[PDB]
Amino acid sequence: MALRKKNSLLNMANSYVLDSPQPSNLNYFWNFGSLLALCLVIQLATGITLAMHYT
Amino acid sequence: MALRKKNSLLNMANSYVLDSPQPSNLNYFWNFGSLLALCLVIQLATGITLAMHYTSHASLAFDSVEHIMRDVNFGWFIRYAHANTASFFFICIYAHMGRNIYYGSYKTPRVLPWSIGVIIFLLLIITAFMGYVLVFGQMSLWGATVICNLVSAIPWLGEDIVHFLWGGFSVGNPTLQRFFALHYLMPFVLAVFALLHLIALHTAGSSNPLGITSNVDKLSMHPYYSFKDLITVFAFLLMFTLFVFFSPDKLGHPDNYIPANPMVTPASIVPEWYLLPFYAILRAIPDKLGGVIAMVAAILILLILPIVDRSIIRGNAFKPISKLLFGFFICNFLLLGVLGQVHIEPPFIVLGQICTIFYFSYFLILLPMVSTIENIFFYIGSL
Amino acid sequence: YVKKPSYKIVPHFLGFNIPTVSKWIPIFGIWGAAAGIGALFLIEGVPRTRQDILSKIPIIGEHWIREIPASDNPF
Amino acid sequence: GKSTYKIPDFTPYLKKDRNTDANRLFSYFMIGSFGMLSAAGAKATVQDFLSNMSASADVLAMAKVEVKLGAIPLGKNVIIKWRGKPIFIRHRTSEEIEEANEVNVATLRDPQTDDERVQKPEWLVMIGVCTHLGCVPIGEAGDFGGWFCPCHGSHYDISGRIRRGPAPLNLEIPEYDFADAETLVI
Amino acid sequence: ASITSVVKTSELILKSPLLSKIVVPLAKTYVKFSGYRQLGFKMNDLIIEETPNMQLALRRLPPTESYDRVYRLIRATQFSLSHKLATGNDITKPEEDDHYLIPYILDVEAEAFEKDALDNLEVV
Amino acid sequence: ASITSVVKTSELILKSPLLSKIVVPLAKTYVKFSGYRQLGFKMNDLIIEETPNMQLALRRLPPTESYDRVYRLIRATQFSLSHKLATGNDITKPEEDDHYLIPYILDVEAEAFEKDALDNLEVV
Amino acid sequence: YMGWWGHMGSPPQKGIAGYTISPFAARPFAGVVHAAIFNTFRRTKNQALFVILPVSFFYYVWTQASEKNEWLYTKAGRHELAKAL
Amino acid sequence: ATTFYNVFVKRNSAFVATILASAFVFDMTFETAIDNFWDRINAGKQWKDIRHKY
Numbered sequence A: 001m002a003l004r005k006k007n008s009l010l011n012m013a014n015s016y017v018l019d020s021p022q023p024s025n026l027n028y029f030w031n032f033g034s035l036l037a038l039c040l041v042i043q044l045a046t047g048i049t050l051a052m053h054y055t
Numbered sequence B: 001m002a003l004r005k006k007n008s009l010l011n012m013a014n015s016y017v018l019d020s021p022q023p024s025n026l027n028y029f030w031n032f033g034s035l036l037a038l039c040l041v042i043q044l045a046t047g048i049t050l051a052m053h054y055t056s057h058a059s060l061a062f063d064s065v066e067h068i069m070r071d072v073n074f075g076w077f078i079r080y081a082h083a084n085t086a087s088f089f090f091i092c093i094y095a096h097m098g099r100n101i102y103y104g105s106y107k108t109p110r111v112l113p114w115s116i117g118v119i120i121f122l123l124l125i126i127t128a129f130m131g132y133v134l135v136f137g138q139m140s141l142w143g144a145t146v147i148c149n150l151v152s153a154i155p156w157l158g159e160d161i162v163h164f165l166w167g168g169f170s171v172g173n174p175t176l177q178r179f180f181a182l183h184y185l186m187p188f189v190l191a192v193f194a195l196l197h198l199i200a201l202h203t204a205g206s207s208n209p210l211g212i213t214s215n216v217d218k219l220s221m222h223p224y225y226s227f228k229d230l231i232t233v234f235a236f237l238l239m240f241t242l243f244v245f246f247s248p249d250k251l252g253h254p255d256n257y258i259p260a261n262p263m264v265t266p267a268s269i270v271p272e273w274y275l276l277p278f279y280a281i282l283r284a285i286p287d288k289l290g291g292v293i294a295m296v297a298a299i300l301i302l303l304i305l306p307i308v309d310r311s312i313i314r315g316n317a318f319k320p321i322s323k324l325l326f327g328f329f330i331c332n333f334l335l336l337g338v339l340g341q342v343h344i345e346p347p348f349i350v351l352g353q354i355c356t357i358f359y360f361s362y363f364l365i366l367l368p369m370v371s372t373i374e375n376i377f378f379y380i381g382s383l
Numbered sequence C: 001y002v003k004k005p006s007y008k009i010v011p012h013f014l015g016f017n018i019p020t021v022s023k024w025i026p027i028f029g030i031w032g033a034a035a036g037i038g039a040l041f042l043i044e045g046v047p048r049t050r051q052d053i054l055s056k057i058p059i060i061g062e063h064w065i066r067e068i069p070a071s072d073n074p075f
Numbered sequence D: 001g002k003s004t005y006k007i008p009d010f011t012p013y014l015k016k017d018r019n020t021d022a023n024r025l026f027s028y029f030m031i032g033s034f035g036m037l038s039a040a041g042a043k044a045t046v047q048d049f050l051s052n053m054s055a056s057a058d059v060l061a062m063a064k065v066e067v068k069l070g071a072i073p074l075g076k077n078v079i080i081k082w083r084g085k086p087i088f089i090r091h092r093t094s095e096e097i098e099e100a101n102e103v104n105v106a107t108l109r110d111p112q113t114d115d116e117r118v119q120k121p122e123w124l125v126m127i128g129v130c131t132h133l134g135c136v137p138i139g140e141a142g143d144f145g146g147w148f149c150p151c152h153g154s155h156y157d158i159s160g161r162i163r164r165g166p167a168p169l170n171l172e173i174p175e176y177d178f179a180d181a182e183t184l185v186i
Numbered sequence E, F: 001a002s003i004t005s006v007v008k009t010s011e012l013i014l015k016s017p018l019l020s021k022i023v024v025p026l027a028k029t030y031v032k033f034s035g036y037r038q039l040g041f042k043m044n045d046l047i048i049e050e051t052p053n054m055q056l057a058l059r060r061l062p063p064t065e066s067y068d069r070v071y072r073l074i075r076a077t078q079f080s081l082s083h084k085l086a087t088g089n090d091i092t093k094p095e096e097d098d099h100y101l102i103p104y105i106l107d108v109e110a111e112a113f114e115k116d117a118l119d120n121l122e123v124v
Numbered sequence G: 001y002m003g004w005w006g007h008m009g010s011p012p013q014k015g016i017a018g019y020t021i022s023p024f025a026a027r028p029f030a031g032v033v034h035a036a037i038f039n040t041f042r043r044t045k046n047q048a049l050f051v052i053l054p055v056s057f058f059y060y061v062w063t064q065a066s067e068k069n070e071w072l073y074t075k076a077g078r079h080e081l082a083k084a085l
Numbered sequence H: 001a002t003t004f005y006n007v008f009v010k011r012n013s014a015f016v017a018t019i020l021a022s023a024f025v026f027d028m029t030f031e032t033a034i035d036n037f038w039d040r041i042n043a044g045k046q047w048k049d050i051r052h053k054y
């Protein structure tokens, strides 16, 4: 059995970002979820950075 | 089927805090995990609260901490609770790592939670330190200088990294504001890792003090360990109360109530009680890079316990020789702690070096040897 | 006639043997180059990296020899 | 419609040269170009973004600190701030200079003679930050009676050379010039 | 470490007259002080079982021996949590401390190590 | 809303001459514009099936009907992701748009609603 | 390696009958006096040497070192301190 | 062409090394190319263009 399935931690990642079974016909409006994830990552990176400079 | 099992979200909570099958014989040393959880919750509550009152600017930081002590309602409590819980966090985490080393929790199949744990231990050190610096008292500023200069050990790029981490030529305002940002952040990262090491542990389940399988006899996490964990919650809060309300400064260094003066460092430099063991290690080694490597290695070397323990038996309950070796190792780690706070003078310079060698020889020599010999003694001794 | 099959066990460790590892030696080489190229690329901005590494490269090295005229430099 | 061995018509999509190396290579050129722009983009993003943590423009502001010397008595060390780092200025006595000139240079982590360090034997000027991890050594203390870093117990000399303890280098000497004989700039 | 390692090394010791003369008494005392018999364990109950090899060895135990092992572990877990020791018949007497598992794990590991060896064979 | 509700209400409309005269033509154009037939679906393919009741109804479908439903959904999913419409024989003709599922779900729900009713009966 | 309720991964159990009584039916502190005195003495005695030996040794070592250090920084210890440095 | 595939693409180690070395080259040349282009479209505007007066 594949490591990605065997190892408990990897298996959780696997279940979300790799093996996760998705419908085959999602259109471009299903992309906002990951854009919101990207916004959230940008906001954390820039935000924590501004917090290093902001008083 | 019960809602707690049906609903995906509840089912995750259920699997951790309610139905989680635990061995039936965990003793009180299994309670540190939940105390560290409680410390982490106290630290988040008091920490976020102090962040509502604290000003990260170097011109105001020390004064904002005085304002917290003096003007904010219950500010004294929140500040001392935060500071003291940082000490209790380390008592509990050394206790928890102690428990794990004594009962062989690092052995298969729990090497992963152990190894994630070693990273939590490093993150706690960096979190607690970054938090120490925010007061911007004398010790704070000097501590910042030293920790940010440990990267100078790294050759060539080292000196430039130092300047980059200070955002200046010295520890100053820039540094203090970035330490505030990261000290706020680091605990959430630490809570992620704390959660991850539990998720890694959930494959094998907790070890137990006998080191045998518990698959034969499991108890639900609640009510048994929930109520067991309350005893230590209240015992912890009793100790917390004695420090926070009655002696809030016993665990502190006076020098941190002097504002940071970059022109002098106090003649008596002694870091937090919990960093003392590694500080003595750093003092012991007379080389820059050497001293730093040894100090970091003193934590990273825990990662090799899974390899160097050659025992066929999990943990020390049944191994008289290993228990004695563990006793000497623990006492040596306390001796290092003590030597961390004496003056750098004879004869403690040589003593600190001997204790440093003994610390490392436990992982590299003694544990592999003793564990090998006890394997043989079990087999021969029981024939 | 053959009485016994003729073989040895090659030394092995953690399921690696020297035959197998020797086939991967080139690949570690390339990955080491990739790590070298990549690491050096990451720190190309670091002034020390230009000063001590990149400006020393023949022909190409002049890319990293840039002086700000002292007329435009407050520091 | 019925036979499963009659593969549906794929001719509108099938490449004639599908098994050539040229065919694979083209697709990998696209994937590799995308990796190349991602790598150029990543590096540029990380470089520009992390540079925020490097000293800001307001911090990068140079001192040129001038100090008098008439004030300073014999056998004393001052501390002048310069770029936030302290500068130890010691007005060394004749016998102090002698003591410094004694140690065989051979046995010195960082081998230097006082002559190399000072440009004027009566003015030891050093960046008073300990070369180990960066505390400021307490002067007059030590074991080589110069300076002792209290942080990890490294002893500096009257030249400010390291003699005992973890510090690897001797106390750095700034760029200092005697404009007058009674004032130096750093 | 593997049980095979431990067993072969023990056999080297029991062969050498000098070695056995000095080691066998040490090991017997060690086992008395170990005190696993005071929770009614056999030595073999304490071997780490969360391993592919050991799980396979334990599946090979005769039903009788397997059921008794479960009982001794349950009983010992109960002593542990009560902070009591075994008394009377629950204490493992030296004559009852049989290596019931060692033969099974040695067979499991013998095959596993042969498998590793033969995976690395070189036709000559 | 329940399929039972929809079906009973529809029957009230078809009963009333006036109502049917004005509603049936509307509903037929609505269905034309709905355009599910252009992906080769029968109306019933579009009923939400992630409920207990509907899962039970779908399990009750005859194997043929069930296999054909799977095919129409696979085929429609493929049209959807390609952004194509059905052509030719794949388009659902009005005569093929049979309520294959409605009888099964109405039986499932009939029992479920009777069960709810009888759970609340009062002996008089 | 550990399952969950119902499939915990115990080797098959047979022949163990387990009995307990209700918490309400039991005295939770039955024999607490006996345990607190005799049982704790038993458990303490059995573990005593594992604590006493390293504590006493490292306390001796610390004591010797702290006494030497104290003595080196007296007037009497001038010469021995000069040699140490 | 097979040869080019075999050398630079077949081994992922080699392909990633090639991509990172290409990124290096691209990064250096793109910087230089945009610098020159930016100076040509904003000619006589920028400080470097009026600096000579002072």
Ligand code: HEM
Pocket: A040, A043, A044, A046, A047, A048, A049, A050, A051, A054
């Ligand atoms: C969802 C995540 C976030 C959102 C939606 C968000 C939104 C915003 C917005 C709208 C502002 C006002 C910006 C402006 O007009 O200047 C701002 C400022 C700020 N944010 Fe965030 N933010 C997020 C995450 C964070 C995080 C994680 C931090 C970490 C500290 C942070 C730190 C800051 C700081 C310091 C400022 C003030 C400095 C400034 O205005 O730029 N933010 N944020």
Ligand code: HEM
Pocket: B029, B030, B031, B032, B033, B034, B036, B037, B040, B093, B096, B097, B100, B105, B106, B110, B113, B114, B116, B117, B118, B119, B120, B121, B190, B194, B197, B198, B201, B205, B206, B207, B208
């Ligand atoms: C924020 C800090 C930490 C928290 C909150 C935490 C919490 C816990 C909890 C709740 C458990 C399960 C119950 C218990 O055994 O006590 C546990 C188990 C464990 N923890 Fe930690 N832990 C932390 C830090 C560490 C560290 C630093 C290590 C290792 C260096 C570690 C290693 C382990 C291991 C190996 C286990 C499995 C032990 C076993 O049950 O046998 N943890 N931890």
Ligand code: HEM
Pocket: B040, B043, B044, B046, B047, B048, B049, B050, B051, B054, B065, B079, B082, B083, B086, B089, B124, B127, B128, B129, B131, B132, B133, B134, B135, B183, B184, B187, B188, B190
């Ligand atoms: C593991 C979690 C944490 C640890 C171990 C920790 C540790 C510390 C320590 C040792 C100090 C020095 C306290 C003193 O002597 O005054 C401190 C200060 C501080 N911590 Fe934390 N902290 C934690 C979490 C947090 C969090 C989540 C925040 C959220 C902002 C926070 C905010 C602060 C602030 C604002 C200060 C400076 C004010 C002060 O000194 O009291 N801390 N922390």
Ligand SMILES: CCCCCC[C@H]1C(=O)O[C@H](C)[C@H](NC(=O)c2cccc(NC=O)c2O)C(=O)O[C@@H](C)[C@@H]1OC(=O)CC(C)C
Pocket: A012, A013, A016, A017, A022, A026, A027, A030, A031, A033, A034, A035, A036, A037, A040, A041
């Ligand atoms: C790394 C381990 C932690 C697991 C969480 C990580 C992220 C994760 O799950 O990623 C997935 C890629 C997920 N997208 C989808 O499910 C997805 C499903 C169907 C279609 C598309 N797109 C269509 O064209 C999708 O994109 C996604 O964007 O969700 C982020 C929000 C997640 O982050 C978090 O929640 C944590 C935090 C950063 C918000």
Ligand SMILES: CCCCCC[C@H]1C(=O)O[C@H](C)[C@H](NC(=O)c2cccc(NC=O)c2O)C(=O)O[C@@H](C)[C@@H]1OC(=O)CC(C)C
Pocket: B012, B013, B016, B017, B022, B026, B027, B030, B031, B033, B034, B036, B037, B040, B190, B191, B192, B194, B195, B196, B198, B206, B221, B225, B228, B229
């Ligand atoms: C609310 C659901 C969210 C799941 C995570 C919350 C916490 C959670 O799982 O709690 C459990 C109660 C857990 N204790 C145990 O496993 C446990 C197991 C065996 C014995 C005992 N005690 C013995 O006598 C135990 O105490 C615990 O304290 O671990 C915290 C650290 C967890 O926090 C996190 O990881 C997230 C973050 C707050 C650190």
Ligand SMILES: CCCCCCCCCCCCO[C@@H]1O[C@H](CO)[C@@H](O[C@H]2O[C@H](CO)[C@@H](O)[C@H](O)[C@H]2O)[C@H](O)[C@H]1O
Pocket: A011, A012, A013, A014, A015, A016, A019, B012
């Ligand atoms: C960015 C910070 C977030 C960190 C948390 C990291 C992981 C994200 C969510 C993990 C929490 C829930 O993830 C948990 O994992 C299991 C096991 O993989 C998943 O289980 C899923 O995959 C497994 C096997 O791949 C299937 O048997 C199962 O039907 C499916 O639900 C569930 O989705 C969820 O119960």
Ligand SMILES: CCCCCCCCCCCCO[C@@H]1O[C@H](CO)[C@@H](O[C@H]2O[C@H](CO)[C@@H](O)[C@H](O)[C@H]2O)[C@H](O)[C@H]1O
Pocket: C042, C043, C045, C046, C047, D046, D047, D048, D049, D050, D051, D054
């Ligand atoms: C793990 C990653 C490895 C470490 C990452 C390195 C972080 C810091 C490295 C470089 C940051 C400072 O390095 C410096 O970057 C800035 C851009 O940010 C460059 O600056 C150059 O480009 C910018 C715009 O791009 C102009 O405003 C500037 O006038 C010009 O000189 C410098 O030429 C480079 O010397």
Ligand SMILES: O=C1C(O)=C([C@H]2CC[C@@H](c3ccc(Cl)cc3)CC2)C(=O)c2ccccc21
Pocket: B122, B125, B139, B140, B142, B143, B144, B146, B147, B269, B270, B271, B272, B275, B276, B278, B279, B282, B295, B296, B299, D151, D152
């Ligand atoms: O000289 C030191 C010093 O060495 C540490 C030390 C001790 C613990 C170290 C450490 C221990 C473990 C890890 Cl994983 C990383 C750092 C960090 C630096 C300090 O905390 C300190 C604080 C205030 C003034 C001086 C000092």
Ligand code: FES
Pocket: D130, D131, D132, D133, D134, D135, D149, D150, D151, D152, D153, D154, D165, D166, D167
């Ligand atoms: S800091 Fe100067 S001695 Fe280490």
